[PDB]
Design a protein around this ligand. Structure first.
Ligand SMILES: CCOc1ccc(/C(=C(/CC)c2ccc(O)cc2)c2ccc(O)cc2)cc1
Ligand SMILES: CCOc1ccc(/C(=C(/CC)c2ccc(O)cc2)c2ccc(O)cc2)cc1
Lengths: 13, 238, 240, 10
């Protein structure tokens, strides 16, 4: 878990 | 799971409300090769952020692990961008509506080498959607199918979640048929139309694949600036 | 056009009868595999299969109605998808293995002999597995293969009236597929669900073809194996 | 003049 896509897929809305 | 319990109307309603906004280009200026790709990549990059929030609203997608979610988006993102572009361009014969303020005719694709070939394929898809009179309800179903399908055959306990995505895919299929029955199509016409729609997805896959190889050829040939996120997305198809 | 007047059963029978034979490989068990000799075997096999493919295509209802240019273009677009779907079909009853030929059955580790081929093998294996779990029938398989031929190049075309003719034939093959599923006893809902699953698999077959085309082109530009003039021109048709 | 073109005639 270090990809940007990772990061975006948890703090979505 | 919520997705499997939905009605077909609720499925369409969900997909409609989940739709991403149409964005504007950062387009008075003259075009050139670096310029136009600049516009396209900046637009693609901003659409990508909205796509991710849209994927999390596609029924079923939230039920999947982050690994699987990441994988589906990595396989599907250019196909989704492209079917989006095609849909937007339906009512502009001969042209591609990247943004309300960025309407590019076929010839303008010659600005970038090899890109007019991709334009032509996109224009043909649009022309196809025009002839079928593709409906917006059908379009959001196709986009959802692409997301869930384009990575599914490319996967112990994980057999239970491929099986989940296939139950969702059947529900979306059920939804397309519902929409066609509601429009008064005969049974024979429903099957034929369903097939017409899914076979265009093979051409959309073909376009993504050819598009990706061009983009993979300009991440090497260091020309346009690619954002970190696109860079990551691109290296998945390595 | 004789094709649109066919019944579903007559469509199936003609397609079953036009099937190409399963060919043997030039595999020589006296020597070990190298990248060059493995690719030599596959290319040689593919080259012979192509000649049978060309004659099979002539027997697909509606295909002969097209001009020579349209025929050439459709086969140039679909040939590798068609070889691959055949391979996956042949391999169905052999979990973990791809049956290129009855004397050439390979698992994924034998794929590693060739730089970058195991990735293609994995995708083909997973598709064979998908067909196995779906219990794909031969009657459904020959419809799918015929759909690939007519569909894959159709979007890249009064040549609009022939384009319409191709779309009519495709609708007949859809009717055929449904007819088969009903006759097998599936409910109406199962029919259109099964129809969708089979057609969506065609997107993955396209994908595999495109990645295969890219690796064959790189091998051609590295002189790994000599290619027949025919194979050169088919590979050429995808050049970009 | 393509080989494919010739072969399709027989
Ligand atoms: C990584 C980000 O780089 C890009 C650059 C361009 C594109 C688009 C196209 C289709 C014209 C394209 C694809 C491949 C190629 O080689 C040329 C052009 C594009 C499609 C839809 C949309 O809404 C915005 C843009 C996508 C990503
Ligand atoms: C000039 C092109 O010559 C070739 C060489 C190999 C292949 C095949 C494969 C599948 C594993 C392959 C594809 C691409 C790649 O990079 C490696 C391997 C192949 C598939 C089915 C079949 O019945 C026979 C052969 C096809 C054409």
């Amino acid at each position: 878990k270090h990809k940007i896509l990772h990061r975006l897929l948890q703090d979505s809305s | 799971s919520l997705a499997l319990s939905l009605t077909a109307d609720q499925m369409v309603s969900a997909l409609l409300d989940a739709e991403p906004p149409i964005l504007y280009s950062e387009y008075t200026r003259p075009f050139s090769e670096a310029s136009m790709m600049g516009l396209l990549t900046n637009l693609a990059d901003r659409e990508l952020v909205h796509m991710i929030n849209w994927a999390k609203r596609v029924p079923g997608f939230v039920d999947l692990t982050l690994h699987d979610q990441v994988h589906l988006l990595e396989m599907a993102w250019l196909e989704i961008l492209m079917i989006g572009l095609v849909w937007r361009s339906m009512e502009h014969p001969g042209k591609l509506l990247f943004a309300p303020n960025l309407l590019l005719d076929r010839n303008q694709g010659k600005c970038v080498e090899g890109m007019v070939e991709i334009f032509d394929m996109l224009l043909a898809t649009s022309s196809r959607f025009r002839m079928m009179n593709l409906q917006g309800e059908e379009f959001v179903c196709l986009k959802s199918i692409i997301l869930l399908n384009s990575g599914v055959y490319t996967f112990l306990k994980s057999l239970e979640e491929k099986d989940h995505i296939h139950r969702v895919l059947d529900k979306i299929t059920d939804t397309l048929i519902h929409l066609m029955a509601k429009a008064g199509l005969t049974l024979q016409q429903q099957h034929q139309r369903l097939a017409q729609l899914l076979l265009i997805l093979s051409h959309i896959r073909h376009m993504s694949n050819k598009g990706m190889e061009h983009l993979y050829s300009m991440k090497c040939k260091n020309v346009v600036p690619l954002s970190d996120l696109l860079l990551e997305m691109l290296d998945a198809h390595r």
